Design a protein around this ligand. Structure first.
Ligand code: UMP
Ligand code: UMP
Ligand code: UMP
Lengths: 148, 148, 148
């Protein structure tokens, strides 16, 4: 697992925010795109993304994450959102990945959960593989937008 | 964390599917058993398992996973399902585990989520322990069926 | 990742329960505080905490977890709860953390999920950082109570 000072040197995080740097992870921020109730949302334009109660939202990360072939992305919801009743349905960030992440966030609470554009909401930890993956990732690769 | 080429040599995955092999994990597939709305389902016979909207399903993995005493199973939903609004409630795969996994998948969306028999739905990563666990797992062990 | 025998020597777990020790993790137990339906609950006094169907609860862990600057806390719901339809919305346990954890647990089932005071419900795994985090955690730090 990469500590904070090693995250700067191993993972390409654009744009990078020093405040998003955690002791052993990086706080991914809300990007320009979102998907709530079957509608695409321009979080960059609208400025926010509101996850209605008991609804899930596909949120595009502001950061474009590029993982080396020997690093795995382990994402967890920011504790703030968890304490708000928000559940994150995160998959692995395969070694070699490159592009903005489409993160599923479910508002299990009865109050709407508002997420400002560029606000930190998911801390991604980076676990180093024992060796570079024989076959780096090649699926939703190079995604710069919300991918379904 | 075991890369793809090391997963072949350290973890017993039966049946094994080369397509389920990920850069740093293995895509567990839907097995023969499932549990939705208080009913047992024969996904092998019925061929599919449908998680109704806002309902959770206990799904038996097609693969029988046997973990060495120094490897921990880290499971995450397949991004495809996450983008569908499906949330996985996965526990740790203790070092030493052996048997098919009962995976809780919650359909947080408003559309039914269909999972074919043998379809990949959960990628399990394998983290190597600093040393073999003093007491390997002995609880729902050797489970070859859905375990409640 | 710390095996069971290394968890005793690296992580400060108070109070510690040998039964909560897993092959590669520790089963965190339900503490004295809980938060369900906008109300604070005295699980120590009341003895239990009931997560109503389709509701989430903020549960304070009985154990006060103190992580070294080079260890990350990876929490997952206990398989028992997962098989019950309970989903855990857990964030990272930053290296250096010290204090009781506020764990979000969502009852996705249609039956109430009862959690006795001191009952194990979340197994926390400990991943060692490649090096001590440059900036250990300093946010909801030293939390001995439910923190929102
Ligand atoms: O919530 C997620 C999780 C992963 N990814 C990215 C990183 C991965 O390379 C890929 C998902 O494939 P898996 O690693 O989950 O198999 O897409 C996302 O965009 N959103
Ligand atoms: O979603 C899961 C997670 C784990 N297991 C298996 C592997 C573990 O050995 C055991 C669960 O015990 P814990 O590791 O969660 O404590 O059952 C499952 O069947 N389904
Ligand atoms: O579910 C959780 C997860 C984490 N923490 C603690 C440990 C962390 O130090 C901090 C949350 O900050 P992050 O690590 O999630 O960024 O609070 C909790 O109390 N509950």
């Amino acid at each position: 697992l990469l500590p904070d000072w090693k995250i700067r040197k191993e993972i390409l995080i654009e744009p990078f925010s020093e405040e998003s740097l955690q002791p052993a992870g990086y706080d991914l921020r809300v990007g320009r795109e979102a998907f709530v109730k079957g509608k695409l949302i321009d979080v960059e334009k609208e400025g926010k993304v509101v996850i209605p109660p008991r609804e899930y939202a596909l949120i595009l990360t502001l950061e474009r994450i590029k993982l080396p072939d020997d690093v795995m992305g382990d994402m967890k919801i920011r504790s703030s959102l968890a304490r708000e009743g928000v559940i994150g349905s995160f998959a692995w960030v395969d070694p070699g990945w490159d592009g903005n992440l489409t993160l599923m966030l479910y508002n299990a609470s009865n109050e709407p959960v508002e997420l400002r554009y560029g606000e930190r909401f998911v801390q991604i930890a980076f676990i180093r593989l024992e060796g570079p993956a024989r076959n780096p990732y090649r699926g939703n690769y190079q995604g710069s937008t919300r991918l379904a």
